[PDB]
Amino acid sequence: NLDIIGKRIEKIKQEHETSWHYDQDHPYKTWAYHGSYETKQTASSMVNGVVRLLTKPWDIIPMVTQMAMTFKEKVDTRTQEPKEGTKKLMKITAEWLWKELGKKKTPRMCTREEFTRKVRSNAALGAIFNKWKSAREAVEDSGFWELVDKERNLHLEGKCETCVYNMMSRAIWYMWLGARFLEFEALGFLNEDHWFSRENSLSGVEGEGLHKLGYILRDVSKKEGGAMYADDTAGWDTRITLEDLKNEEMVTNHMEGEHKKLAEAIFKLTYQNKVVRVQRPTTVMDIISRRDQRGSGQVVTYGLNTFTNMEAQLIRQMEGEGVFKSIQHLTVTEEIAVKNWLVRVGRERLSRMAISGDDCVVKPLDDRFASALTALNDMGKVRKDIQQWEPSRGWNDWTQVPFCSHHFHELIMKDGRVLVVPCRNQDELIGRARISQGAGWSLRETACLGKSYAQMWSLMYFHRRDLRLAANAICSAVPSHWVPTSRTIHATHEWMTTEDMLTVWNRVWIQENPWMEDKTPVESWEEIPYLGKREDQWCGSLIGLTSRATWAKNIQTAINQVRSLIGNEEYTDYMPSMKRFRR
Numbered sequence: 001n002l003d004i005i006g007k008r009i010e011k012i013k014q015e016h017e018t019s020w021h022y023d024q025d026h027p028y029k030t031w032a033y034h035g036s037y038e039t040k041q042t043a044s045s046m047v048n049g050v051v052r053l054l055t056k057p058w059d060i061i062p063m064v065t066q067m068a069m070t071f072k073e074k075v076d077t078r079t080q081e082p083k084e085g086t087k088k089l090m091k092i093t094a095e096w097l098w099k100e101l102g103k104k105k106t107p108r109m110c111t112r113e114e115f116t117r118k119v120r121s122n123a124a125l126g127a128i129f130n131k132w133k134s135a136r137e138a139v140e141d142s143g144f145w146e147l148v149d150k151e152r153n154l155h156l157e158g159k160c161e162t163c164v165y166n167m168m169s170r171a172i173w174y175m176w177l178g179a180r181f182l183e184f185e186a187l188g189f190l191n192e193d194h195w196f197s198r199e200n201s202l203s204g205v206e207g208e209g210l211h212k213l214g215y216i217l218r219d220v221s222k223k224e225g226g227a228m229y230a231d232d233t234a235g236w237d238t239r240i241t242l243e244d245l246k247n248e249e250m251v252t253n254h255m256e257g258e259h260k261k262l263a264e265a266i267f268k269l270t271y272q273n274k275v276v277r278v279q280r281p282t283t284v285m286d287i288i289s290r291r292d293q294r295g296s297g298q299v300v301t302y303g304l305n306t307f308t309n310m311e312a313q314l315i316r317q318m319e320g321e322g323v324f325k326s327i328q329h330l331t332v333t334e335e336i337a338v339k340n341w342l343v344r345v346g347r348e349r350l351s352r353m354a355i356s357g358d359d360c361v362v363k364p365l366d367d368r369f370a371s372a373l374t375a376l377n378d379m380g381k382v383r384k385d386i387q388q389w390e391p392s393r394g395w396n397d398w399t400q401v402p403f404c405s406h407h408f409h410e411l412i413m414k415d416g417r418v419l420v421v422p423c424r425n426q427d428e429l430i431g432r433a434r435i436s437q438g439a440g441w442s443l444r445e446t447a448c449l450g451k452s453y454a455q456m457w458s459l460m461y462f463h464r465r466d467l468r469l470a471a472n473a474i475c476s477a478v479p480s481h482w483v484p485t486s487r488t489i490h491a492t493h494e495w496m497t498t499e500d501m502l503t504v505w506n507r508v509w510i511q512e513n514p515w516m517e518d519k520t521p522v523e524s525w526e527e528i529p530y531l532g533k534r535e536d537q538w539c540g541s542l543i544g545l546t547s548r549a550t551w552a553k554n555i556q557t558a559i560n561q562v563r564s565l566i567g568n569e570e571y572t573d574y575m576p577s578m579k580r581f582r583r
C-alpha cells in the first residue's frame with residue numbers, strides 16, 4: 001500500500017501544499033482516496049467540411065448528423081477474487097502461453113533511439129504537455145533524459161516518484177512522456193517484435209489489416225466444430241483482476257539482467273499499484289489509487305488484453321470439453337489433465353480463435369462451449385447484453401460474425417476470383433469521415449484528412465456503391481499531389497500514400513493476397529466488384545433515394561464547389577472511372 005504509492009502521493013502533496021485538503025464529500029467507494037487540490041481547466045468533435053460538402057444526401061440522415069454532436073461509474077466497481085480452481089487454471093494456462101509465445105521470440109529492451117523515432121513520426125503514446133511544449137521538444141532536450149534516468153534508477157531501487165496516471169465505456173489514462181518511455185523500454189518489445197502476430201500467437205491478428213480479417217475468419221470457419229461464438233465482455237478493462245495482472249507479470253520469467261528488473265518495476269509499481277489524478281466539477285483534483293483494473297499505455301494494453309483474452313477463451317474451451325469438473329478446486333490429476341491438454345491440443349485450440357485485445361471469435365470443438373460459463377463468470381469476464389447464466393447465441397455463418405466492428409462478405413469477381421471484404425453499416429463510415437479532432441486545422445490539412453478517408457474507402461469499401469463514388473469525388477476535389485494526413489496500436493494503413501490507388505488495389509487484393517491463386521493484376525476500377533444492390537441497401541446504402549440520385553448525376557458541381565474554396569491547384573477527374581460517368 002502506502003510504502004509503494006506514498007512517495008508519488010507525498011510529491012504531489014508538496015506541489016499544492018497551499019490547497020491539500022482530505023475532502024469529506026468524496027464520491028469514491030472502490031478507489032482509495034488520499035486528498036484534493038485546486039485546478040481549473042477541461043476537446044470536442046469538429047466537422048470535416050470537405051467530406052460534408054461532398055456527402056450532401058447524408059445531411060438529413062440523423063444516424064450520420066448526430067455522430068458529430070455533444071461509464072465513470074463502472075471504473076468505481078469491484079471484481080471479486082476468483083476461486084482456487086479458477087486461480088490454478090489461469091496460472092497453468094498463463095505459464096504455458098508465455099512459453100509458447102517465447103519459443104520463437106526473445107524479450108529485449110526498446111531504446112531511446114526507437115522511442116525518439118516514434119515521437120518524430122506522430123504516434124498516440126498518451127503523454128501530456130509542464131516544462132517542454134510537445135513530445136518532439138522534450139525528446140531533443142537532454143534535461144528530460146536526466147529526469148528519465150533518475151526515475152529509471154529509482155525503479156532499479158524498487159521505488160517510483162513520478163509514474164502517475166491522469167484520468168479522462170472508455171477511460172484514457174495519460175502519463176507524462178518520461179513514464180511512457182520507461183513503460184516502452186521494458187514492455188514495448190511485445191508490440192515492436194509482434195508477439196501477438198497470427199504467425200507467433202495462432203489466435204492473434206496483430207499487424208493484420210482490415211483486408212486480412214475476413215480471410216482469417218473464413219479459415220477458422222473451415223475447422224470441424226460447433227457455432228462461431230463472438231461474445232463481448234461488459235467493460236473488459238474494468239474486469240482485469242489482480243490475479244490477471246500477476247499472470248501477465250510472468251512474462252518477466254523469460255527476461256534477464258537489467259531488463260528483468262525494469263519490467264518487474266513497471267508491473268509492481270505502476271500496473272499492480274496505480275496513482276491517478278481526476279477532474280471533479282465539485283473544480284478540484286482528486287489523488288486516487290487502486291491495485292486492479294487495466295490502466296497502462298494503449299499499445300501495452302492491447303497486447304496484455306490479447307494475452308489474457310487468449311488465456312480466458314482456452315479455459316472456457318477446457319470447460320466445454322470437460323477437462324475439469326469444478327472451479328472450486330483442481331485435484332492433482334486434473335492439474336496434470338489441464339497441462340496434458342495444453343501440450344497435446346493447446347496450439348490447435350489457439351488456431352480456432354481470432355483475438356484482437358478484448359474482441360474474440362471462437363470456433364470450439366462443439367456447442368458444449370455455449371453453456372460453459374462458470375470459469376468465464378468467476379474470472380470476472382461477464383458477457384455484455386445476456387443474463388449471467390443464459391447460454392451464448394452462436395453464429396452459423398462466418399459472414400454474419402461480428403469482429404473489430406465489422407462483418408465480412410464473400411464477393412466474386414467477373415473473372416471468378418474470390419474477395420473476402422470488410423463491411424459495416426455505411427452511416428457509421430460516413431459519419432466518422434465527417435469528424436475531425438483538435439484545433440488549428442488549415443483548409444489544406446482538413447482536405448488531406450478527407451483524402452485519407454477517401455483512399456481508405458477505395459481500398460477497403462470499394463464494394464459499397466456510395467463510398468466508391470464519394471471516394472472518387474473527394475480525390476477529384478483535393479489537389480492530386482497533396483499528401484493524405486491524420487493526427488497520430490494500428491496495423492499499417494496502405495491508403496496512407498500518394499501512390500496510384502488502383503496499383504495499391506492490385507497489390508493488396510491480388511499480388512500480395514496469400515489467399516489469391518492467380519496473380520494477374522486488374523487494369524481498371526470497372527473490373528473490381530460491388531456487393532449486390534439489395535445487399536448494399538441492407539448495409540445502409542442510400543441507393544434508390546432521390547437525394548442520392550441527383551447527388552450522383554451532379555457530383556461534378558460539388559467537386560468544383562470544393563475545388564474553388566481550396567483554390568488554384570492541379571485537379572484530376574476520377575469520376576469518369578465510374579461506369580455511370582464512363583460514357
Ligand SMILES: c1cncc(Cn2cccc2)c1
Nearest residue numbers: 206207209210404489490491
Ligand atoms: C490492432 C493491431 N493490429 C491489428 C488489429 C486488428 N484490426 C485491423 C483493423 C481493425 C482491427 C488491431
Ligand SMILES: [Zn+2]
Nearest residue numbers: 160161162163
Ligand atoms: Zn516510476
Ligand SMILES: [Zn+2]
Nearest residue numbers: 407423424539
Ligand atoms: Zn455489409
